[PDB]
Design a protein around this motif. Structure first.
Motif, PDB file in Angstrom:
ATOM      1  N   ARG A 110       0.774  -1.244   0.000  1.00 52.26           N
ATOM      2  CA  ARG A 110       0.000   0.000   0.000  1.00 52.26           C
ATOM      3  C   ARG A 110       0.804   1.292   0.000  1.00 52.26           C
ATOM      4  NH1 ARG A 110      -5.276  -1.362   3.678  1.00 52.26           N
ATOM      5  NH2 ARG A 110      -3.854  -0.518   5.277  1.00 52.26           N
ATOM      6  N   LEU A 111       0.355   2.232  -0.826  1.00 50.11           N
ATOM      7  CA  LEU A 111       0.999   3.522  -1.018  1.00 50.11           C
ATOM      8  C   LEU A 111       0.653   4.533   0.077  1.00 50.11           C
ATOM      9  CD1 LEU A 111       2.462   5.803  -2.800  1.00 50.11           C
ATOM     10  CD2 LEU A 111       0.316   5.908  -4.086  1.00 50.11           C
ATOM     11  N   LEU A 112       1.679   5.215   0.583  1.00 44.02           N
ATOM     12  CA  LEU A 112       1.536   6.296   1.547  1.00 44.02           C
ATOM     13  C   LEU A 112       2.078   7.590   0.991  1.00 44.02           C
ATOM     14  CD1 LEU A 112       2.745   5.054   5.011  1.00 44.02           C
ATOM     15  CD2 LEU A 112       0.367   5.230   4.203  1.00 44.02           C
ATOM     16  N   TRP A 113       1.394   8.681   1.330  1.00 49.30           N
ATOM     17  CA  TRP A 113       1.790  10.042   1.000  1.00 49.30           C
ATOM     18  C   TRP A 113       2.323  10.714   2.260  1.00 49.30           C
ATOM     19  CZ3 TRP A 113      -0.581  13.041  -3.395  1.00 49.30           C
ATOM     20  CH2 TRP A 113      -1.137  12.174  -4.365  1.00 49.30           C
ATOM     21  N   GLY A 114       3.517  11.277   2.195  1.00 48.48           N
ATOM     22  CA  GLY A 114       4.068  11.949   3.346  1.00 48.48           C
ATOM     23  C   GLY A 114       4.083  13.437   3.098  1.00 48.48           C
ATOM     24  N   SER A 115       3.286  14.168   3.861  1.00 51.16           N
ATOM     25  CA  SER A 115       3.282  15.620   3.811  1.00 51.16           C
ATOM     26  C   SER A 115       4.669  16.220   4.146  1.00 51.16           C
ATOM     27  CB  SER A 115       2.215  16.135   4.783  1.00 51.16           C
ATOM     28  OG  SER A 115       1.899  17.488   4.537  1.00 51.16           O
ATOM     29  N   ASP A 116       4.927  17.433   3.661  1.00 55.06           N
ATOM     30  CA  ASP A 116       6.101  18.203   4.068  1.00 55.06           C
ATOM     31  C   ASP A 116       5.757  18.980   5.342  1.00 55.06           C
ATOM     32  OD1 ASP A 116       4.641  19.997   1.778  1.00 55.06           O
ATOM     33  OD2 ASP A 116       5.638  21.354   3.143  1.00 55.06           O
ATOM     34  N   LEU A 117       6.744  19.195   6.212  1.00 55.92           N
ATOM     35  CA  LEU A 117       6.511  19.863   7.498  1.00 55.92           C
ATOM     36  C   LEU A 117       5.823  21.218   7.359  1.00 55.92           C
ATOM     37  CD1 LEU A 117       7.131  19.845  10.694  1.00 55.92           C
ATOM     38  CD2 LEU A 117       8.833  21.548  10.010  1.00 55.92           C
ATOM     39  N   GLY A 118       6.186  21.969   6.324  1.00 52.54           N
ATOM     40  CA  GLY A 118       5.572  23.270   6.104  1.00 52.54           C
ATOM     41  C   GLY A 118       4.066  23.123   5.977  1.00 52.54           C
ATOM     42  N   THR A 119       3.640  22.252   5.068  1.00 55.04           N
ATOM     43  CA  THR A 119       2.227  21.983   4.828  1.00 55.04           C
ATOM     44  C   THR A 119       1.563  21.467   6.100  1.00 55.04           C
ATOM     45  OG1 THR A 119       2.611  21.550   2.492  1.00 55.04           O
ATOM     46  CG2 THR A 119       0.633  20.616   3.471  1.00 55.04           C
ATOM     47  N   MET A 120       2.278  20.600   6.811  1.00 53.23           N
ATOM     48  CA  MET A 120       1.778  20.088   8.080  1.00 53.23           C
ATOM     49  C   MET A 120       1.416  21.210   9.045  1.00 53.23           C
ATOM     50  SD  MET A 120       4.027  16.829   8.996  1.00 53.23           S
ATOM     51  CE  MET A 120       4.135  15.377   7.953  1.00 53.23           C
ATOM     52  N   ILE A 121       2.331  22.153   9.289  1.00 51.47           N
ATOM     53  CA  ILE A 121       2.051  23.203  10.272  1.00 51.47           C
ATOM     54  C   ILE A 121       0.945  24.137   9.773  1.00 51.47           C
ATOM     55  CG2 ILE A 121       4.556  23.075  10.961  1.00 51.47           C
ATOM     56  CD1 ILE A 121       3.099  26.453  10.274  1.00 51.47           C
ATOM     57  N   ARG A 122       0.947  24.385   8.469  1.00 53.87           N
ATOM     58  CA  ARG A 122      -0.033  25.250   7.836  1.00 53.87           C
ATOM     59  C   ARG A 122      -1.470  24.656   7.932  1.00 53.87           C
ATOM     60  NH1 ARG A 122      -0.584  27.467   2.670  1.00 53.87           N
ATOM     61  NH2 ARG A 122       0.455  25.669   1.694  1.00 53.87           N
ATOM     62  N   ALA A 123      -1.595  23.368   7.629  1.00 54.63           N
ATOM     63  CA  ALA A 123      -2.859  22.640   7.795  1.00 54.63           C
ATOM     64  C   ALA A 123      -3.281  22.529   9.250  1.00 54.63           C
ATOM     65  CB  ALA A 123      -2.773  21.230   7.162  1.00 54.63           C
ATOM     66  N   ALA A 124      -2.334  22.273  10.147  1.00 56.52           N
ATOM     67  CA  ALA A 124      -2.638  22.196  11.578  1.00 56.52           C
ATOM     68  C   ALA A 124      -3.166  23.517  12.151  1.00 56.52           C
ATOM     69  CB  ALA A 124      -1.430  21.722  12.373  1.00 56.52           C
ATOM     70  N   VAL A 152      -4.841  27.703   2.611  1.00 57.24           N
ATOM     71  CA  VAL A 152      -4.358  26.350   2.943  1.00 57.24           C
ATOM     72  C   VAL A 152      -5.091  25.253   2.145  1.00 57.24           C
ATOM     73  CG1 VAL A 152      -4.019  24.632   4.785  1.00 57.24           C
ATOM     74  CG2 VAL A 152      -3.536  27.035   5.265  1.00 57.24           C
ATOM     75  N   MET A 153      -6.425  25.262   2.198  1.00 57.09           N
ATOM     76  CA  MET A 153      -7.221  24.249   1.506  1.00 57.09           C
ATOM     77  C   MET A 153      -6.958  24.258   0.010  1.00 57.09           C
ATOM     78  SD  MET A 153      -9.059  21.637   1.911  1.00 57.09           S
ATOM     79  CE  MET A 153      -9.716  21.687   3.581  1.00 57.09           C
ATOM     80  N   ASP A 154      -6.974  25.440  -0.606  1.00 60.65           N
ATOM     81  CA  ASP A 154      -6.679  25.542  -2.036  1.00 60.65           C
ATOM     82  C   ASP A 154      -5.357  24.871  -2.418  1.00 60.65           C
ATOM     83  OD1 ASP A 154      -9.135  26.705  -2.514  1.00 60.65           O
ATOM     84  OD2 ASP A 154      -8.319  28.628  -3.215  1.00 60.65           O
ATOM     85  N   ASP A 155      -4.295  25.152  -1.666  1.00 58.22           N
ATOM     86  CA  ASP A 155      -3.025  24.449  -1.846  1.00 58.22           C
ATOM     87  C   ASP A 155      -3.160  22.933  -1.680  1.00 58.22           C
ATOM     88  OD1 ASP A 155      -1.021  27.090  -0.220  1.00 58.22           O
ATOM     89  OD2 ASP A 155      -1.997  27.006  -2.195  1.00 58.22           O
ATOM     90  N   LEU A 156      -3.849  22.490  -0.631  1.00 60.06           N
ATOM     91  CA  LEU A 156      -3.983  21.057  -0.388  1.00 60.06           C
ATOM     92  C   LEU A 156      -4.662  20.341  -1.553  1.00 60.06           C
ATOM     93  CD1 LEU A 156      -5.134  21.170   3.321  1.00 60.06           C
ATOM     94  CD2 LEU A 156      -2.810  20.917   2.473  1.00 60.06           C
ATOM     95  N   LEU A 157      -5.646  20.985  -2.165  1.00 60.18           N
ATOM     96  CA  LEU A 157      -6.420  20.337  -3.218  1.00 60.18           C
ATOM     97  C   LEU A 157      -5.971  20.704  -4.646  1.00 60.18           C
ATOM     98  CD1 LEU A 157      -8.003  18.885  -1.066  1.00 60.18           C
ATOM     99  CD2 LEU A 157      -9.850  20.543  -1.461  1.00 60.18           C
ATOM    100  N   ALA A 158      -5.042  21.655  -4.773  1.00 56.74           N
ATOM    101  CA  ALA A 158      -4.417  21.941  -6.069  1.00 56.74           C
ATOM    102  C   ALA A 158      -3.683  20.698  -6.589  1.00 56.74           C
ATOM    103  CB  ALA A 158      -3.470  23.089  -5.948  1.00 56.74           C
ATOM    104  N   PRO A 159      -3.534  20.557  -7.925  1.00 55.53           N
ATOM    105  CA  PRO A 159      -2.858  19.351  -8.416  1.00 55.53           C
ATOM    106  C   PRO A 159      -1.616  19.056  -7.581  1.00 55.53           C
ATOM    107  CG  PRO A 159      -3.655  20.596 -10.253  1.00 55.53           C
ATOM    108  CD  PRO A 159      -4.025  21.393  -9.040  1.00 55.53           C
ATOM    109  N   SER A 160      -1.412  17.793  -7.233  1.00 55.59           N
ATOM    110  CA  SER A 160      -0.481  17.468  -6.169  1.00 55.59           C
ATOM    111  C   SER A 160       0.882  17.087  -6.684  1.00 55.59           C
ATOM    112  CB  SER A 160      -1.044  16.343  -5.300  1.00 55.59           C
ATOM    113  OG  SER A 160      -2.215  16.762  -4.620  1.00 55.59           O
TER     114      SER A 160
END
Ligand SMILES: O=c1[nH]cc(F)c(=O)[nH]1
Ligand SMILES: O=c1[nH]cc(F)c(=O)[nH]1
Ligand SMILES: [Mg+2]
Ligand SMILES: [Mg+2]
Ligand SMILES: [Mn+3]
Ligand SMILES: [Mn+3]
Ligand SMILES: [Mn+3]
Ligand SMILES: [Mn+3]
Lengths: 486, 486
Positions: A179-193, A272-280
């Motif tokens: 199974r495939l996992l996606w690992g967020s970058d720390l920047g995105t992590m803090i921004r989403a949090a 934040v959301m726009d970035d998260l859902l923009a082409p990945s």
């Protein structure tokens, strides 16, 4: 630039990701021969002495296919608007309004024993003082917080990986799957949090009244949750093949919309959301590929974003088939979602053939929880429905979630330890394993006298060859502890 | 000696009790004329300037009649044994075994702002250091603890009294009625607390899984309790006239038997229980009368002893009518008891005529919760059943207990203060009344927009003429606070 095709997807840049792990965390608990057709750690690649197989990288190409597959259709626009507004409205009525998350609180909330992702691929603890990030991660965090506070877009980078977990032997020795996992970058992590922490906490405290069960305790919360499901006439499982990869961004965006409007800082959360859902952008090692569709699963809020989309899709199919208002089906029904995992209980007379079809039309691939061959089936008792790997049982005392014995036995064959190359190696006695052992004893209690005794032995042998010896309680005492709590 | 008849009962000795209180704790909140046919404090006797009536002592004779009435029949012995063993067994399986209560812990647990009863009739605080009784009560307590530790019988003395409470106007200006109270003596109190404290605590922590709801929170616990009741097909109220006075000691003894065997010191608890259920000595002032039958209601464990007898009687009638094993009816049913107060929910097809009769045969006097004229009726929805003065409502979010507006309005007309002779007197502004006011606001929220607003006004006028002015929250905010908690 590049561009460039890899695994059926556009290449956006060169990769920076470490090589895929070639090791497992699981050690056998006993040197003796393994029970026939027993589960084992997933495939470890070339260096895996159990079987010859493709490289881990070819396994991952395989996992990327569905993300270039033609998307299913959107639900009818009128229905989608109705169910979104209903869900949103129910959330307005149930969520306790929260105050904005600080930088300190966002950093605190993150799992410190997992990777920081792009660009440093450091374990998060390495740059953590106990209260703040410093050094490299200090820079990444701080820059991200500035971007967040100034409502400025920043493009997330995900690192792909393959889940180290126990799998059925088939997925090792037959057709190899991992199974495939996606690992967020720390920047995105803090921004989403910061953005979505407050909403996620609000949601988590509403885990029994609202259908998203993230944060629930099976033991304490299950009986009340299951009692609610039992107020209704018809019950159904639905499992889904490849949930994450079959998701539509359009639907994910509506889940995201609801999350934004219920956040305490909507203007900052929108960026934040726009970035998260923009082409990945997904780093597979050699390249960062573009994955336009499906679920990007790296982040703190992901599991709730995913459950929210699920809520939308279930209602859309239900509304589409039954023709009852989404608000009214929510008064005639009880739902449970956890990512791809659903229990629908209803009093509505739902055409299960038309329901399956409507879902299939959205691009989803529904299957029964342990039955195979659809349409999806409905039952007139909750008795026996499954949720979160547990069977829902009910008796004189109430409902509960029971872990099946195959699963208990399994946790007694394997233990978690440092990464290593051969699954079959034993380590010494795990005196980090008395907490786990109690829970298991507890899990077995619910299977009655004879079974409990047989795992009581297995548990005692292990507690002997360990730095802490244990008072193994009597059946009735532990059953009482498990069922009635606290 | 004496002996000697008073109120239809044998006189055992001369009385020592203070005169019956001639005052009420209730003050009007407003000087203006009272809404027509509104509830008022119960009759205060000769000095009561509202109406001329009998003396308080004649009112009490009236309350004593039923205790000399011929007892109803015992349930069939075979059924009584079966249901007792089942109840006991269910309790063995659910109660967490407890460790014995100390003298310190028994004394601590007692309500310090109520009378010590025989012989000192002191308020309990007057001889309390914060951790021990000293002086007179020190003697009574210590002697009792010695009797308890040496398993020695001691004969309890109850002081009769008449409940100061709000009643329908009829019970003041029509046929005068005022409810009888039994006041335990401090010795018996400490003896019962040591003996049965552990059992009562065990029971209290099992308030949701077991039918005895003593210790429940309507707000936090109600929704889960009511969701359980809603798992079943048929629902019924039953109210009972004169529950306490129609009880059989024989049945009370079986409840007591169960309490003994599940106490951590059964040999010491047996002496206590035997005394509690031995023919009772009740001080009416001029005399101590002997009351052979009915419930002696003075003590810490009483409400649970009473609920346990109730559990027995319901099952006995159910078993007798349905002919299903008590254990099996407990898997086909959900019960709620609180003293005389019942909700039975079942899937069994119960003949409601035969049920009423079987109860009537035991000597009970069942009536419907707000309907009048029996047999008892069953309904196919929990929607609208009543429990603990609350209507059980259910909606999109779940079940809850809603206090009816007549009751809310009532709590806004009257406030609790020091004892005084005229009910209609106002005191000043009650700045001890902001806690009560929030709850009421909360209670009114559940009646929707228009009603909430009208009590919001009434609450604000009162918060003005008071030493603390209040942020009166918006409807949706308080509704959310009430329904979803914590
Ligand atoms: O329904 C599910 N159960 C367990 C899982 F790990 C998953 O992905 N989906
Ligand atoms: O059923 C009852 N409700 C309220 C009471 F005070 C009582 O005695 N009984
Ligand atoms: Mg699945
Ligand atoms: Mg009553
Ligand atoms: Mn929760
Ligand atoms: Mn919750
Ligand atoms: Mn409780
Ligand atoms: Mn409880």
């Amino acid at each position: 630039r590049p561009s460039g095709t890899y695994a059926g997807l556009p290449i956006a840049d060169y990769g920076d990701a470490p090589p895929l792990s070639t090791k497992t965390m699981f050690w056998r608990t006993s040197p003796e021969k393994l029970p026939p057709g027993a589960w084992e750690p997933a495939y470890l690649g070339s260096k895996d002495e159990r079987v010859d197989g493709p490289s881990l990288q070819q396994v991952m190409r395989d996992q990327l296919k569905p993300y270039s597959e033609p998307r299913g259709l959107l639900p009818p626009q009128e229905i989608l608007d109705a169910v979104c507004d209903a869900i949103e409205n129910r959330l307005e009525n149930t969520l306790e309004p929260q105050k904005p998350w600080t930088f300190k609180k966002a950093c605190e909330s993150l799992d410190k024993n997992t990777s920081s992702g792009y660009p440093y691929h450091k374990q998060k603890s390495k740059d953590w003082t106990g209260s703040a990030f410093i050094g490299d991660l200090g820079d990444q965090a701080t820059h991200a917080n500035n971007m967040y506070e100034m409502g400025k877009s920043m493009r997330p980078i995900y690192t792909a990986a393959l889940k180290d977990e126990l799998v059925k032997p088939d997925k090792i020795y037959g057709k190899i799957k991992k199974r495939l996992l996606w690992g967020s970058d720390l920047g995105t992590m803090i921004r989403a949090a910061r953005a979505f922490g407050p909403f996620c906490d609000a949601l988590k405290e509403t885990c029994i009244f609202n259908p998203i069960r993230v944060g629930m305790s099976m033991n304490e919360d299950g009986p009340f949750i299951f009692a609610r499901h039992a107020n209704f006439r018809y019950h159904m499982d639905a499992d889904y093949t490849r949930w994450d990869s079959t998701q539509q961004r359009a639907i994910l965006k509506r889940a995201g919309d609801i999350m934004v409007r219920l956040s305490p800082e909507p203007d900052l959360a929108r960026v934040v959301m726009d970035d998260l859902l923009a082409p990945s952008l997904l780093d597979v090692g050699d390249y960062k590929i573009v994955v336009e569709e499906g679920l990007p699963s790296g982040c703190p809020c992901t599991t709730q974003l995913n459950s929210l989309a699920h809520w939308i899709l279930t209602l859309c199919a239900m509304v589409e088939v039954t023709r009852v208002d989404p608000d009214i089906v929510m008064q005639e029904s009880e739902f449970s979602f956890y990512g791809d995992d659903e229990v629908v209980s209803t009093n509505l007379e739902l055409d299960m053939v038309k329901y399956t079809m409507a879902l299939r039309r959205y691009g989803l691939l529904p299957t029964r929880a342990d039955k195979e061959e659809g349409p999806l089936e409905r039952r007139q008792t909750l008795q026996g429905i499954s949720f979160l790997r547990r069977a829902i049982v009910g008796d004189q005392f109430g409902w509960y979630g029971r872990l099946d014995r195959a699963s208990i036995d399994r946790q007694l064959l394997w233990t978690k330890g440092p990464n290593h190359q051969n699954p079959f190696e034993t380590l010494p006695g795990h005196a980090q394993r008395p907490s786990q052992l109690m829970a298991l004893l507890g899990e077995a209690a619910m299977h009655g006298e004879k079974y409990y005794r047989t795992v009581a032995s297995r548990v005692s042998k292990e507690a002997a060859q360990s730095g802490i010896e244990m008072v193994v309680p009597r059946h009735r005492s532990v059953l009482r502890w498990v069922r009635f709590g606290t």
